[PDB]
């Protein structure tokens, strides 16, 4: 959760991480880390390390926006991050980005010093880059830059983002009828560069319903490219695509899905783990789109 | 895409007819209960799209084949078939709720506007 | 207890890493690594932390070591061979 006296979970290299705002009082709250490891004998999580990070500027309203594991652009090493909103109630919001190292020590990367309040369209990207959204004004700020760039192209949604081979950084999305080649969906090479593809993304019919996207593979035949992307929809469907060709549809039990991830788990036993807003989840097979598990109440999935 | 759906439909019909002519007690049911789930999947693939005037002549056809094959294997009817019919009619109306009677009335007025899919409506 | 230990995690593109080019060499305790990118890492086993990272231009394709000379031979793509102490 995102508040004072609230916490958030994460996962990193077979050991779970927990981040908590805890009021100092003797002083600003202190960001506390507890990394826990599964014991396997006692069937419980034992603490193996912890780490405190001190905050200055005795103002209230500390709020944990987002946490995951991304990378360092300098080293190309996967390390976990936290976003921390510092709200002094003066219509000013810092939004610190912090990175944790293997010494359980923190490192500021972005002070980020905004005036207005940040909302829904938050994403974090490989080189420690933040990508945020208000009224259809998409912005992003990178480490290595320190500067708030605006997205030149006028997008509605940014369904997927991340790095691709030979291109470096990418956003899917749209701008503003059963033909594969039409696609309605502009890729965009970040830093206000060329669209780079509008040839073999999902058809325009599907284009109205999809609410989340997750790419599984990207090959490069010529100046164009070929992506296999999973989507998921308002009508509770999981769809695969290959060169714009819809294959392997599944019909989810529950409603209004939010995200999809991939679990390898052995030789060919590949599962797509789907979460929803109803605090429940499914696991569908790969290689035969067929529901396999239907867990419920599910505060979090990892 | 429409060509792909059409070709899957035709492929499945042809598999069904092959089992109908050839096949023994086990192999018939094998090919048939393959084709039936294929037509389920294709219904779901077509039901994932909003309204689609150009699709309806394929959707009504697919649900007709699905009903016919379902009923012929079961050797009888059910109420799930009436729900399928109700769903396809709701779709035809969404292009342009209460009960099957008023549904049919409004659907047939909407077809007597002469969008030409009467070769599927009359089969329904 | 655990038959496997993850002591580091590196940046990778979609799908995964391209095979062949990444290299891994255990000297005595430390481990030298490349992922077919512009970096070479040293990891001091007994310490999950890295010792040092080396930026090569023009992504590395192959590594070799000499323990008596304490030398690391590295091959870049369109550039040549580097020999670091």
From Swiss-Prot, chain A:
Source organism, top-level taxon: Eukaryota
UniProt-annotated location(s): Nucleus
Entry's disease: Fanconi anemia complementation group B: A disorder affecting all bone marrow elements and resulting in anemia, leukopenia and thrombopenia. It is associated with cardiac, renal and limb malformations, dermal pigmentary changes, and a predisposition to the development of malignancies. At the cellular level it is associated with hypersensitivity to DNA-damaging agents, chromosomal instability (increased chromosome breakage) and defective DNA repair. Some severe FANCB cases manifest features of VACTERL syndrome with hydrocephalus.
Role of this protein: DNA repair protein required for FANCD2 ubiquitination.
Assembly and oligomerization: Belongs to the multisubunit FA complex composed of FANCA, FANCB, FANCC, FANCE, FANCF, FANCG, FANCL/PHF9 and FANCM. The complex is not found in FA patients.
Protein name per the record: Fanconi anemia group B protein
Name of the encoding gene: FANCB
Parent-protein residues present: 7 to 329 of 859
UniProtKB/Swiss-Prot annotation, chain B:
Superkingdom to which the source organism belongs: Eukaryota
Membrane-spanning residues: none
Effect listed in the UniProt record for changing residue 60 to P: In FANCG; associated with a mild clinical phenotype; disruption of HES1-binding; no effect on FANCA-binding
Cellular compartment(s): Nucleus; Cytoplasm
Tissue: Highly expressed in testis and thymus. Found in lymphoblasts.
Role played: DNA repair protein that may operate in a postreplication repair or a cell cycle checkpoint function. May be implicated in interstrand DNA cross-link repair and in the maintenance of normal chromosome stability. Candidate tumor suppressor gene.
Assembly and binders: Belongs to the multisubunit FA complex composed of FANCA, FANCB, FANCC, FANCE, FANCF, FANCG, FANCL/PHF9 and FANCM. The complex is not found in FA patients. In complex with FANCF, FANCA and FANCL, but not with FANCC, nor FANCE, interacts with HES1; this interaction may be essential for the stability and nuclear localization of FA core complex proteins. The complex with FANCC and FANCG may also include EIF2AK2 and HSP70.
Medical condition linked: Fanconi anemia complementation group G: A disorder affecting all bone marrow elements and resulting in anemia, leukopenia and thrombopenia. It is associated with cardiac, renal and limb malformations, dermal pigmentary changes, and a predisposition to the development of malignancies. At the cellular level it is associated with hypersensitivity to DNA-damaging agents, chromosomal instability (increased chromosome breakage) and defective DNA repair.
Protein name in the entry: Fanconi anemia group G protein
Organism name: Homo sapiens
Gene this chain is encoded by: FANCG
Curated annotation (Swiss-Prot), chain C:
Compartments where found: Nucleus
Highest taxon above the source species: Eukaryota
Function description: Plays a role in Fanconi anemia-associated DNA damage response network. Regulates FANCD2 monoubiquitination and the stability of the FA core complex. Induces chromosomal instability as well as hypersensitivity to DNA cross-linking agents, when repressed.
Subunit annotation: Belongs to the multisubunit FA complex composed of FANCA, FANCB, FANCC, FANCE, FANCF, FANCG, FANCL/PHF9, FANCM, FAAP24 and FAAP100. Forms a subcomplex with FANCB and FANCL.
Protein name, per record: Fanconi anemia core complex-associated protein 100
């Amino acid at each position: 959760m995102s508040s004072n006296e609230q916490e958030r979970l994460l996962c990193y290299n077979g050991e779970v991480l927990v981040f908590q705002l805890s009021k100092g009082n003797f002083k600003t709250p202190i960001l506390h880390v507890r990394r826990m490891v599964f014991d396997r004998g006692t069937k419980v999580f034992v603490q193996k390390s912890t780490g405190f990070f001190t905050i200055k500027e005795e103002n209230s309203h500390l709020k944990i926006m987002c946490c995951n594991c991304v990378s360092d652009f300098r080293t190309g090493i996967n390390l976990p991050y936290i976003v921390i909103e510092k709200n002094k109630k003066n219509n000013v919001f810092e939004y610190f980005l912090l990175i944790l190292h293997s010494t359980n020590k923190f490192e500021m990367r972005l002070s980020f010093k905004l005036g207005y309040e940040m909302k829904d369209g938050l994403r974090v990207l490989n080189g420690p880059l933040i990508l945020w959204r208000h009224v259809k004004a998409f912005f992003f700020i990178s480490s290595q830059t320190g500067k708030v760039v605006s997205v030149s192209g006028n997008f509605s949604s940014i369904q997927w983002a991340g790095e691709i081979e030979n291109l470096g950084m990418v956003l899917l999305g749209l701008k503003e009828d059963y033909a594969i080649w039409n696609t309605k969906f502009c890729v965009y090479s970040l830093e206000s560069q060329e669209v780079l593809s509008d040839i073999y993304i999902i058809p325009p019919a599907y284009s109205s319903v999809v609410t989340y996207v997750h790419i599984c593979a990207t090959e490069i035949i010529k100046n164009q490219l070929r992506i296999s992307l999973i989507a998921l929809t308002r009508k509770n469907q999981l769809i695969s695509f290959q060169n714009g060709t819809p294959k392997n549809v599944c019909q989810l039990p529950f409603g209004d899905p939010c995200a999809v991830q991939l679990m390898d788990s052995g030789g060919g036993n590949l599962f797509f783990v789907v979460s929803f807003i109803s605090n429940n989840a499914c696991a569908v097979w790969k290689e035969s789109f067929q529901v396999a598990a239907k867990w419920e109440k599910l505060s979090l999935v990892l | 895409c429409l060509d792909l759906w059409r070709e899957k439909n035709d492929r499945l019909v042809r598999q069904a007819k092959v089992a109908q002519n050839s096949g023994l007690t086990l192999r018939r049911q094998q090919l048939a209960q393959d084709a039936l789930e294929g037509l389920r999947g294709l219904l779901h693939s077509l039901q994932g799209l909003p309204a689609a005037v150009p699709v309806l002549p394929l959707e009504l056809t697919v649900t007709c084949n699905f009903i016919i094959l379902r009923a012929s294997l079961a050797q009888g009817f059910t109420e799930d078939q009436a729900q399928d019919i109700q769903r396809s009619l709701e779709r035809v109306l969404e292009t342009q709720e209460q009960g099957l009677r008023e549904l049919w009335d409004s659907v047939l007025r909407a077809s007597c506007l002469l969008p030409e899919l009467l070769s599927a409506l009359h089969r329904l | 207890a655990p038959r496997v230990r993850y002591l580091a995690g590196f940046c990778c593109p979609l799908g995964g890493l391209a095979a062949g080019k990444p290299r891994v060499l255990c000297h005595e305790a430390e481990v030298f690594l490349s992922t077919g990118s512009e970096l070479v890492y040293v990891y001091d086993q007994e310490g999950g932390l890295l010792t040092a990272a080396f930026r090569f231009p023009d992504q590395v394709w192959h590594l070799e070591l000499l323990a008596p000379r304490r030398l690391l031979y590295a091959l870049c793509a369109r550039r040549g061979l580097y020999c670091l102490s």
